[PDB]
Amino acid sequence: NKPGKATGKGKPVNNKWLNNAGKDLGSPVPDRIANKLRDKEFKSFDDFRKKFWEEVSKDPELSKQFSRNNNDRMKVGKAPKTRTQDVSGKRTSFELHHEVYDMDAISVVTPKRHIDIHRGK
Amino acid sequence: NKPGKATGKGKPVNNKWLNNAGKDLGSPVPDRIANKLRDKEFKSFDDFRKKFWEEVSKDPELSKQFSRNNNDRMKVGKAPKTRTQDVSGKRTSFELHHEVYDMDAISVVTPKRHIDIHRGK
Amino acid sequence: NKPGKATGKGKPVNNKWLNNAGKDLGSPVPDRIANKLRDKEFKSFDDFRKKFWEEVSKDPELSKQFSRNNNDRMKVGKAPKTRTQDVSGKRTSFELHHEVYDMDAISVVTPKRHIDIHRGK
Amino acid sequence: NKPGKATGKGKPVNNKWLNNAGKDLGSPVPDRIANKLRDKEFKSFDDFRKKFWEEVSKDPELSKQFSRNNNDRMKVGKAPKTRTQDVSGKRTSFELHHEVYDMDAISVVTPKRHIDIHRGK
Amino acid sequence: MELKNSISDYTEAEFVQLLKEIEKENVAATDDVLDVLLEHFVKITEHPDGTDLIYYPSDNRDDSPEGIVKEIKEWRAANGKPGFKQ
Amino acid sequence: MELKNSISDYTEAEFVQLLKEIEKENVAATDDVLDVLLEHFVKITEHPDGTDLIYYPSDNRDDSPEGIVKEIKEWRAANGKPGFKQ
Amino acid sequence: MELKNSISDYTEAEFVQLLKEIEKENVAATDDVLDVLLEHFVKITEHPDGTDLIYYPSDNRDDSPEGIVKEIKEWRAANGKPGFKQ
Amino acid sequence: MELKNSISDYTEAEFVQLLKEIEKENVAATDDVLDVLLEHFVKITEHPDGTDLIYYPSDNRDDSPEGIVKEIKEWRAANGKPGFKQ
Ligand SMILES: [Zn+2]
Ligand SMILES: [Zn+2]
Ligand SMILES: [Zn+2]
Ligand SMILES: [Zn+2]
């Protein structure tokens, strides 16, 4: 809701970036993605989120990790759909968890895990 | 549902046909409509409901009692939308109550009133 | 294509404003419409055209002179469709003829008549 | 068009089935496709064409020779779009040429080549 | 949706959906899609007034999808042409 | 089309397109899509009568998209709420 | 388009159109309409993996409308359930 | 949806929606609407190969909406033409 610039380094990820989105704090912001968003202004986190996912769709190493239907979603700024086993009610797409626009404190998690995180689980 | 032939004569109605759809047993099947459906075959009650509403959209004296958007609904066999105050959850259109194809045992009720009828009220 | 302000008085029109759109120079800019556009800035004539038709859709005395489908067109800035007998090829909607943004020199004509005008007929 | 049964054996094809659709009499009906349609009834040639293209989209060795957008077309019974250089006016998809349901007298040609065939060329 | 080749392929309800699709395109920024749908409507109805049934309805009937269907049905019958699908 | 989360994101012309999308689904075989669009309409307009503006218009106004937009515009202004995008 | 009650009401081609409609909504600004279409897809296919057939296709088949249809057809047959309309 | 008269009026996300509208019509019973959308695509992109970008993608790129947008973006930039809306 409040503007600001994106900061952070992120981390290198393998060809299975979101395999742990449903565990612990999920997956980190890929370093390559952080390089594209670093120092950019965003009117709101939601804005950061759209931009984040659009960047993902443009990174060859990450996009290939998603199906055609999920890449199309990311291309328009929407988070990819999670597997059915990871949804939670109407929350059916990956979410961003804060540990601001500090990419080093932001992670990607499934809805089910995100709920548990905020409940101490 | 098993097929059958519609029967019954119905009752005469004024220019406020559904004004009392939210009370007692609701509004009766108009005689003019009953005449058009009498002795006709229907594969199911749902098929009857669609034809029912379709005939309503064709009856000049009845269609004029509905808005343009509601007339369009009836034309494709869908029940018209009730007023906001008469809905009940996802049930937002008039329903047909049985007191299977006996038009004299069928009436039009709002979803709110219909639920009360079956809850003993 | 070039910006500018709309100027002019226009003329009073009856309940058959566009009955002569296919004759002479067609119908004039209604005075009531001219009052709504006078002194307004437009980036281009096309912009003036959209605004013009939207104003028409808002004037009760004029809108009632058009069918529901033609009013919907004008509401979005598009010129109403002419009768089939007045179209010319792919040109099927009323056009604006210049005799700039001077409403006193602008008139509404059918495609067929518009072509003839520019051919001395 | 009068109904009939498809007949013929067709010819074996490589991974460049339509490469010569723009030359001579075009590409022949693949034997594998002929086997699937042989002795089948069709209310019209148009009905044959739709089933034809549908079978093509189901043949692994043939479908892989087409883009995703063209495979989708064939799946619904529409002929695939030809390359821009092979179209002719509003005719922008491969056509079937008769040399009515004899698959051995039917070939696939581009609209450009097809017109020349019938113009004596 | 799907554009059928003739009136006999459309039930009345289906024809109403085609009309609502025309209405939707009528308020679109351009007439690109609208015009193709209007050509199809003119072609299958075969009514001499073509688009006038839509943009210039007669005062003798309702300016609505139902009215258009009714007028079309009456004209095709008066001229011995196949009607809507039953 | 695209569903904005506020009336202020819509120009009057854009809102009419939404009403037209609602009318198209209004004649679809089911109400699955229609109902989502109606919930959205109710949410952004914030009018207490909600869907009644579409299905039960007052006799004091025109039963049309232009009438629906007009009534919303007046009610929102009278209640000091942001209006359509200029 | 029109949402049928079961797989047996859809020819393969018609099912492909439903998939393309899902794809169109997949790139829309919101998931409002998409989600309803996805619930319908899950309901009629009755496949245990539901939306995964769409967003997480198996490596053993093509990530395409044709592949989805094929996998669905093979599963419904392997489980003695009614297939697509012929 | 709304058809803009220039590539510069479209953001990359909006262009993908158009490609998706094209794919939906691509599987429709006829090509009536599809063909109008293709003419529009050809007109605004201004690429000499026109529809080939959709139906005959080069092997050096992905056969997908993202690939189509990427190729258009590069070709337009290489030819000094305005790009997608930022
Ligand atoms: Zn969190
Ligand atoms: Zn009951
Ligand atoms: Zn002129
Ligand atoms: Zn030939």
Features:
heterooctamer; A: 121 residues; alpha+beta; two-stranded antiparallel ribbon; 5 helices; 33% helix; E: 86 residues; mainly alpha; 55% helix
Summed up:
The complex is a heterooctamer, with four copies of chain A (121 residues) and four copies of chain E (86 residues). Chain A has helices at residues 31-37, 45-58, 60-63, 68-75, 111-117; strands at residues 4-5, 27-28, 41-42, 95-98, 106-109. Chain A is an alpha+beta fold.
Query: Largest interface, counted with CB-CB under 8 A?
Result: A-G, 16 and 18 residues
Estimated share of beta-strand residues of chain E: under 5%
Structural class assignment of chain A: alpha+beta
Report the radius of gyration of chain E as a whole number of Å.
Answer: 12 Å
State the domain count of chain E: 1
Largest sheet of chain A: 3 strands, antiparallel
This entry's quaternary arrangement is heterooctamer
Tally of helical runs of chain E? 4
Kindly report the name of the CATH homologous superfamily of chain A: Colicin/pyocin, DNase domain
Helix percentage range of chain E: 40-55%
When the domains of chain A are counted, the total is 1
PDB class: hydrolase/inhibitor
Keywords: hydrolase/inhibitor, hydrolase-inhibitor complex, zinc, toxin, plasmid, nuclease, hydrolase, antibiotic, H-N-H motif, bacteriocin, endonuclease, metal-binding, antimicrobial, DNA hydrolysis
Assembly: octameric
Entry title: crystal structure of the mutant N560A of the nuclease domain of ColE7 in complex with Im7
